[PDB]
Amino acid sequence: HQAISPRTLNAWVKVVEEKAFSPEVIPMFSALSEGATPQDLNTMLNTVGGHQAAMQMLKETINEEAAEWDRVHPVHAGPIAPGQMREPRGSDIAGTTSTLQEQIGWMTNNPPIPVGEIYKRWIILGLNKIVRMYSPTSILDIRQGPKEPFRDYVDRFYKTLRAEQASQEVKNWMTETLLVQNANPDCKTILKALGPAATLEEMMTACQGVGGPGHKARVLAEAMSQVINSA
Amino acid sequence: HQAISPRTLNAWVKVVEEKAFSPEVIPMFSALSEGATPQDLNTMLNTVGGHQAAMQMLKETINEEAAEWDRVHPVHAGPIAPGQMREPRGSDIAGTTSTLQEQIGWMTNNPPIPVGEIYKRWIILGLNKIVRMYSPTSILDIRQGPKEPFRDYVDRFYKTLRAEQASQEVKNWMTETLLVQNANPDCKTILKALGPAATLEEMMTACQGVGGPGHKARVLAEAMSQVINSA
Amino acid sequence: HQAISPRTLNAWVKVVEEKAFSPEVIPMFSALSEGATPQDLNTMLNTVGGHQAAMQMLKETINEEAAEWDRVHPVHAGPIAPGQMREPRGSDIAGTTSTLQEQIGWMTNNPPIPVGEIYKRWIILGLNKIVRMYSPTSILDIRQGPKEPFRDYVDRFYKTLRAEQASQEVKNWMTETLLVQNANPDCKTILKALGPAATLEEMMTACQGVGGPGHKARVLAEAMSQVINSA
Amino acid sequence: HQAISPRTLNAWVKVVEEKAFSPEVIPMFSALSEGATPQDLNTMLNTVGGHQAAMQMLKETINEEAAEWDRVHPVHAGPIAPGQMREPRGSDIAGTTSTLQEQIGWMTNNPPIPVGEIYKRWIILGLNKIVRMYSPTSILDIRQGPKEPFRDYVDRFYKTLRAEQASQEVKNWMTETLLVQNANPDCKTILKALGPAATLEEMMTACQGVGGPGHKARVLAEAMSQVINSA
Amino acid sequence: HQAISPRTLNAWVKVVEEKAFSPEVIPMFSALSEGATPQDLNTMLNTVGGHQAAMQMLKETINEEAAEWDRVHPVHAGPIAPGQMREPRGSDIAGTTSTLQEQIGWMTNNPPIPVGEIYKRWIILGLNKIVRMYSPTSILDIRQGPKEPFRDYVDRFYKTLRAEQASQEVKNWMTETLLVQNANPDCKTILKALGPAATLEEMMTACQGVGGPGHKARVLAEAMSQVINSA
Numbered sequence A, B, C, D, E: 001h002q003a004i005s006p007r008t009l010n011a012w013v014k015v016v017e018e019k020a021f022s023p024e025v026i027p028m029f030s031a032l033s034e035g036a037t038p039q040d041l042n043t044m045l046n047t048v049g050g051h052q053a054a055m056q057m058l059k060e061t062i063n064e065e066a067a068e069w070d071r072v073h074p075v076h077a078g079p080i081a082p083g084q085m086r087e088p089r090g091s092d093i094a095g096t097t098s099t100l101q102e103q104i105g106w107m108t109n110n111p112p113i114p115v116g117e118i119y120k121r122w123i124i125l126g127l128n129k130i131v132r133m134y135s136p137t138s139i140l141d142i143r144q145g146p147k148e149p150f151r152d153y154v155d156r157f158y159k160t161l162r163a164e165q166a167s168q169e170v171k172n173w174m175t176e177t178l179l180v181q182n183a184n185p186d187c188k189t190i191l192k193a194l195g196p197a198a199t200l201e202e203m204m205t206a207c208q209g210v211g212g213p214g215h216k217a218r219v220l221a222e223a224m225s226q227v228i229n230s231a
């Protein structure tokens, strides 16, 4: 038995966190899981932080693969044998309903049953599906909607920034730069009307009125003022 | 067995209520629960008042750690009569399906199984996740939305006040200082138009028409008249 | 032997990377290494990515502590074969010249020798020294010197960016918003006159002459012309 | 023993030279070394031409992995002569202190010790580190410093060209189109005034005085004359 | 054996940290180490924090004294097993190659060998040399060089402040009242023009160009304009 080492698992986690789910994660995984048991592969998968939608898609793909294996490979009545090794099922290959001893026995039996390799193939199918379909979210993509309240936008921005992979200084710089930048024009003009030294609460109070009756009437009157004056 | 004392439990409760879930709770916990059985740790956790979201995240982390323990650690189906002590499961370490005597036996038998230490590590992981992800709400954060009715804002304000950790006089001071200050400009203009001695019912009646047809027509007409008289 | 779990080790790594070496790492380490062997502690220390200066200072502190332990504690001349084990030394406590079985034997023998606890104390002393003395480097701190060539500053910036913990999109935004901003005034004037659409190669070509005879003559002539025109 | 074929090894060398150390080298390496002994992997690594810094980082990563393997895996005191082989160490897995026969015995014995697979994992970790941190040098990146003498820049350019992978005609075209282009403005002015037919010796003679007292005085006088004539 | 008490050792540490290495440390040391073994003397010396240069000079003096003792005192060839002990050497007196039991036996045997007294004399000679030749560094002595970049001076200032023995509030006050004051005139002019409310990053940005072509040209132009206007 050669269980996955802390350095290898950490390298896998850093690869996933640095490349998000770019295609380059597919080779790295295959390179960091050679000879791995299904338990080691499950440890690799469960240690990933974030990307909950991607892991959900991966779990769905693994479940479909296990169901297909169960369909194609029938169960046996289970007669006793001198070796008495039960035939693995989809859950056994996925490691959900099997122990490390059972996986090792299957992998080192004669003839061998490479449950680890089948599970790797399932995980690679899921990873390819993730690469095709999943697009990671970023603090750079958090923009205020045309009618979204400024408080809701600030809450979304801070929720995304809390899960962002960056240092605290970088996160403070992101707050100083992108929050006002990615606001909608109605709130952005008010924010620019305020000084650059305004604290968060002052911006919240300033934009608390955007989309209300008073602000709507004020902007409508300001727009009509130009057309009246030009006439 | 030195169970947790009422003084230590009370001190933990005050630490949680005073520092919300700032990083400072992690040392205090580690200092107030050394040598504690999983039952004592559960008693410490369940005594926390409020912070239901943080408690939910902590429970999710604890369940994840227990599931990972169950996955990695196999369960033997053969009972042994000499030294009859079952191997703890994840829920047994978490104290959900284990008794105090069983936890003491695990913490005392040779070789020791530090169920309390493992549970404490799981709780610390959950607390670190809470510190990273959880932001407690305060009465200072209850602001009226631009399109939110004043009655709904008042209901939210009083619901948050009822859960605020403060004395009654402080709560009345917050009611008299923050309810009008943290309202949207459309309602705040009407509230300032009313006298400072206006009651809650008068304040609600005055703002009952904000966002309605009459109030919107009135503000639009006021803005139009201002810009027309400017010309 | 309750060896450190993959999730605990990964959580330690993320704590170190997220908090750099702020004091908050000290409570986490103590909470994540309770009951750990010197081998486990060395595994936690060796898995830290980056912060080479901090790890060097930690290793120096550990070496001083081991040397002091060796100075205070003398060796024994005659080994006791029956029912006795070798007395640990500084390197044995630090795990450099010790095996996991020997460490477990020391912690399990009566009377116990808490080699893990002594090593934890040494590591905490080193971590406190790091917190006092070490300041991490950031991409935000990379600024062009008054006389530094623009190529050298760009090389330093890109090295720090490659070492930075961030997503690729965030790194691209960092390059787009930090490289020109943190340049010196002599290069910043040319970069701003070049336009926002300029590429990196165009920017380096435009600043290739800053500090050369022609650039110095040109800026001196501009200043002289201004002061003569004022006269 | 399926030793690496000359065509496979040459294809690996061409992959490394063509792609530098882009991520694409990782899938190819794993594809070209599957089933390889540590000796074959060492032959693959040692045949790489150039990229001395990248090979140094790879060797450092391999050394760290071997040291960690030695730390985790203790040695055995008493050798077993009948029907047993020496347990591999970090250097044995890396192939530094191991022979091909011992490697084949390890990957063939029951239970197998996949020394080739472990060494492949270490090399893949090093390659990932290279991909993250290493940027290859190119003749296109050789530029004259603002105060660098033209002779030194020409020497650097010709050294890089000698190290460049290109045909002799292509290298001549690079000399004819890149040396003058990537010179600093002070030298570029003189080179352009010299004419396209100027030889290398003529260009180096013409720029021999850039940065000297006479050249600086002349350029300062030209700028001063321009600004005085404007007045 | 009257080993040095924790209060005595801590008092010695406070004496060194308060008086730096003024002559006053010599009477205190002799008063705080009377009757001490070489081990206690080494514990007193090694616990001193900071003053690395002074400790280096002290160790050099101790090594010189040990070498002179070894030169003057020859070794003995034939050991005397019954009723005799090894004759101390220079390193034995210094405690480097001696154990506490041997030191006590030397200071107790008849005739006594005052290894503690000899080592005290050596340490006193080293301390006298330190008082004569060593001057401690202070945050008050950190000044910007006439040509030193402002960033380098800020880095030196913050390193010295981190190494300074003061409270955090005192360190903040030192930063607020010493950084600008001890800057060179070229940077001080810009810092004063920036205003007292300027932040550290703003101050570094404002002084990023001092010593560059533009700043030199501008100051030369200002001086030239002044003298021309006088004419």
Ligand SMILES: O=P(O)(O)O[C@H]1[C@H](OP(=O)(O)O)[C@@H](OP(=O)(O)O)[C@H](OP(=O)(O)O)[C@@H](OP(=O)(O)O)[C@H]1OP(=O)(O)O
Residues within 6 Å of the ligand: B212, B213, B216
């Ligand atoms: O606030 P209400 O009195 O109930 O009227 C609203 C309002 O239209 P007006 O302010 O022009 O009267 C909305 O404007 P927004 O707040 O969304 O900007 C509009 O929504 P849209 O202009 O975006 O479509 C919506 O619907 P609609 O104009 O289609 O009628 C309309 O609702 P009602 O007049 O039906 O109540």
